[PDB]
Amino acid sequence: PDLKNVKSKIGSTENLKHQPGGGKVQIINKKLDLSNVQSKCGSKDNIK
Amino acid sequence: MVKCDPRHGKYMACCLLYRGDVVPKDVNAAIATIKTKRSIQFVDWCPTGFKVGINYQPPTVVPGGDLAKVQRAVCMLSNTTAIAEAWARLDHKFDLMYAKRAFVHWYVGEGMEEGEFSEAREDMAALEKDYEEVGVDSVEGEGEEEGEEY
């Protein structure tokens, strides 16, 4: 009558390494350039 | 309506069907009450463990019956390790008849193999261990019974 300790069929065997982990995000942006500036509403020559 | 103790098994899935004068909020509250009474342990690998259905027609009892009449009623189908533990009994009564090869000539006599019984036993023993793997739900614990020193 000894069955020889029969094993299960068929399980979550494909999940045994699984968690799963998460990816990443980082946003974060670049500064625009506003260095092209000069005023016009005054005098630079006729002041002299 | 099966001779197995659910408190000894572990709940796995439920479908609840509602009939008659029924309110969806009260069905929601009833099921929420079961989920907060977590002594009715469901598997931790399936928290969303309920399906629901609701129908407007109340049950009719066939005349000459014994069932009381009601404005509303509930039917359930439940999957739980307890009923596989009832199968594990029915397999160990097969095993006892087959351990003395009792009756097998009424079936070999039809042109079966005795090999079929041995195949069937082993298939069933594989099923009981399939259910053992999902009874093992790797649920987390709660506390220890004792405290500590320092």
Coordinates of C-alpha atoms in Angstrom, one line a residue:
Chain A
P1 CA 0.0 0.0 0.0
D2 CA 3.0 2.5 0.2
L3 CA 2.3 5.1 -2.5
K4 CA 6.0 6.3 -2.7
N5 CA 5.2 9.9 -1.5
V6 CA 3.5 11.1 -4.7
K7 CA 4.1 14.8 -5.8
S8 CA 1.6 17.5 -6.7
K9 CA 0.5 18.4 -10.3
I10 CA 0.7 21.3 -11.5
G11 CA 1.6 24.4 -9.5
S12 CA 2.8 28.0 -9.4
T13 CA 6.3 26.7 -10.4
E14 CA 6.8 29.5 -12.9
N15 CA 6.5 32.1 -10.1
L16 CA 9.3 30.8 -7.8
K17 CA 11.8 33.7 -8.7
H18 CA 9.0 36.3 -9.2
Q19 CA 8.4 39.4 -7.1
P20 CA 8.3 41.5 -9.4
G21 CA 10.5 44.6 -9.1
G22 CA 9.7 48.2 -10.2
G23 CA 11.2 50.4 -12.9
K24 CA 12.2 54.1 -12.4
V25 CA 11.2 57.7 -13.5
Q26 CA 13.0 61.0 -13.0
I27 CA 11.4 64.2 -14.5
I28 CA 13.3 66.8 -14.0
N29 CA 13.6 69.2 -16.9
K30 CA 16.1 71.6 -18.6
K31 CA 16.2 75.4 -18.2
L32 CA 15.3 77.5 -21.3
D33 CA 17.8 80.3 -22.2
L34 CA 16.6 84.0 -21.7
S35 CA 20.1 85.6 -22.2
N36 CA 19.0 87.4 -25.4
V37 CA 17.8 90.6 -23.6
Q38 CA 18.1 94.3 -23.9
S39 CA 15.8 97.3 -23.1
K40 CA 14.8 99.9 -25.7
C41 CA 12.7 102.5 -23.7
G42 CA 15.7 104.9 -22.9
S43 CA 18.9 106.5 -24.2
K44 CA 22.5 105.2 -24.7
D45 CA 23.9 107.9 -27.1
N46 CA 21.8 111.1 -26.8
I47 CA 22.4 111.1 -23.0
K48 CA 26.0 112.2 -23.9
Chain B
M1 CA -24.5 21.2 2.3
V2 CA -21.2 19.1 2.3
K3 CA -19.9 17.3 5.5
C4 CA -16.7 19.3 5.9
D5 CA -15.7 22.0 8.5
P6 CA -14.9 25.3 6.6
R7 CA -13.0 26.6 9.7
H8 CA -10.6 23.6 9.2
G9 CA -10.3 24.5 5.5
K10 CA -9.5 27.8 4.0
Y11 CA -11.8 29.9 1.7
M12 CA -10.6 30.3 -1.9
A13 CA -13.4 31.8 -4.0
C14 CA -17.2 32.6 -3.4
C15 CA -20.0 33.5 -5.8
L16 CA -23.1 34.9 -3.9
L17 CA -26.5 35.0 -5.8
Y18 CA -29.3 37.1 -4.3
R19 CA -33.1 36.9 -5.0
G20 CA -36.1 39.0 -4.3
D21 CA -36.4 42.2 -2.3
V22 CA -32.6 43.0 -2.2
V23 CA -30.6 46.3 -1.9
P24 CA -27.1 46.5 -3.5
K25 CA -25.8 48.6 -0.6
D26 CA -27.0 46.0 1.9
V27 CA -25.3 43.2 -0.2
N28 CA -22.1 45.3 -0.2
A29 CA -22.5 45.8 3.7
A30 CA -23.1 42.0 4.2
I31 CA -20.0 41.0 2.2
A32 CA -17.9 43.8 3.8
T33 CA -19.0 42.3 7.2
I34 CA -17.7 38.9 6.2
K35 CA -14.3 40.4 5.0
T36 CA -13.9 42.2 8.3
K37 CA -14.6 39.0 10.2
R38 CA -11.3 37.7 8.9
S39 CA -11.5 34.6 11.1
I40 CA -13.3 33.5 7.9
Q41 CA -9.9 33.3 6.3
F42 CA -9.7 33.5 2.6
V43 CA -6.4 32.9 0.7
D44 CA -4.0 35.7 0.8
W45 CA -3.2 35.2 -2.9
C46 CA -6.7 36.4 -3.8
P47 CA -8.0 39.4 -1.8
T48 CA -10.8 40.2 -4.3
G49 CA -12.4 36.9 -3.2
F50 CA -16.1 37.5 -4.0
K51 CA -18.4 37.5 -7.1
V52 CA -22.0 38.8 -6.7
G53 CA -25.3 38.4 -8.7
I54 CA -28.7 40.0 -7.9
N55 CA -32.2 39.0 -9.4
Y56 CA -35.6 40.5 -8.7
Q57 CA -37.7 37.2 -8.6
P58 CA -38.0 35.7 -5.0
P59 CA -37.9 31.9 -4.6
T60 CA -41.2 29.9 -4.9
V61 CA -41.7 26.7 -2.8
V62 CA -43.5 23.9 -4.5
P63 CA -46.7 23.0 -2.7
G64 CA -46.5 20.1 -0.3
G65 CA -43.0 21.5 0.9
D66 CA -41.5 22.5 4.2
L67 CA -39.2 25.5 3.4
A68 CA -40.5 28.8 4.7
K69 CA -41.5 31.5 2.2
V70 CA -39.4 34.6 2.1
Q71 CA -39.4 38.1 0.4
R72 CA -35.6 37.6 -0.3
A73 CA -33.0 34.7 -0.4
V74 CA -29.3 33.9 -0.9
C75 CA -27.5 31.0 -2.8
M76 CA -23.7 30.4 -2.7
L77 CA -21.0 28.4 -4.5
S78 CA -17.7 28.2 -2.5
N79 CA -14.2 26.9 -3.3
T80 CA -12.2 26.0 -0.2
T81 CA -9.5 23.4 0.8
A82 CA -12.0 21.7 3.1
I83 CA -13.8 19.9 0.3
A84 CA -10.4 18.6 -1.1
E85 CA -9.8 17.4 2.4
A86 CA -13.2 15.5 2.0
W87 CA -11.8 14.0 -1.2
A88 CA -8.7 12.9 0.6
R89 CA -11.0 10.7 2.6
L90 CA -12.8 9.2 -0.3
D91 CA -9.3 8.4 -1.7
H92 CA -8.2 6.6 1.5
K93 CA -11.4 4.4 1.3
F94 CA -10.6 3.6 -2.4
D95 CA -7.0 2.8 -1.2
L96 CA -8.3 0.3 1.5
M97 CA -10.5 -1.7 -1.0
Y98 CA -7.6 -1.6 -3.5
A99 CA -5.0 -2.6 -0.8
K100 CA -6.9 -5.9 -0.7
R101 CA -7.9 -5.7 -4.4
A102 CA -11.6 -6.1 -3.3
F103 CA -14.3 -6.0 -6.1
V104 CA -11.8 -5.4 -8.9
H105 CA -13.0 -8.4 -11.0
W106 CA -16.5 -6.8 -11.4
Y107 CA -14.6 -4.0 -13.4
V108 CA -11.7 -6.0 -15.0
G109 CA -14.6 -8.3 -16.1
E110 CA -15.8 -5.4 -18.4
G111 CA -12.4 -5.2 -20.1
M112 CA -10.8 -2.5 -18.0
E113 CA -7.2 -2.8 -16.7
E114 CA -6.3 -3.1 -13.0
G115 CA -3.6 -0.6 -14.1
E116 CA -6.4 2.0 -14.3
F117 CA -7.0 1.9 -10.6
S118 CA -3.3 2.5 -9.8
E119 CA -3.3 5.4 -12.4
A120 CA -6.4 6.9 -10.8
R121 CA -5.1 6.6 -7.2
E122 CA -1.9 8.4 -8.2
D123 CA -3.8 11.2 -10.1
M124 CA -5.9 11.8 -7.0
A125 CA -2.8 11.8 -4.7
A126 CA -1.3 14.4 -7.1
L127 CA -4.5 16.5 -6.7
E128 CA -4.4 16.4 -2.9
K129 CA -0.9 17.8 -3.0
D130 CA -2.0 20.4 -5.7
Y131 CA -4.5 21.7 -3.1
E132 CA -1.8 21.5 -0.4
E133 CA 0.4 23.9 -2.4
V134 CA -2.5 26.5 -2.5
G135 CA -3.5 25.8 1.1
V136 CA 0.1 27.1 1.6
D137 CA -0.8 30.7 0.7
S138 CA 2.4 32.2 2.3
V139 CA 0.3 34.6 4.3
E140 CA 2.2 36.8 6.8
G141 CA 1.8 36.5 10.6
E142 CA 0.6 38.7 13.4
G143 CA 2.6 38.6 16.7
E144 CA 4.2 36.3 19.3
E145 CA 2.4 34.9 22.4
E146 CA 5.2 36.1 24.8
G147 CA 7.3 39.3 25.4
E148 CA 11.0 39.8 25.9
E149 CA 13.8 40.8 28.6
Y150 CA 16.5 43.6 28.5

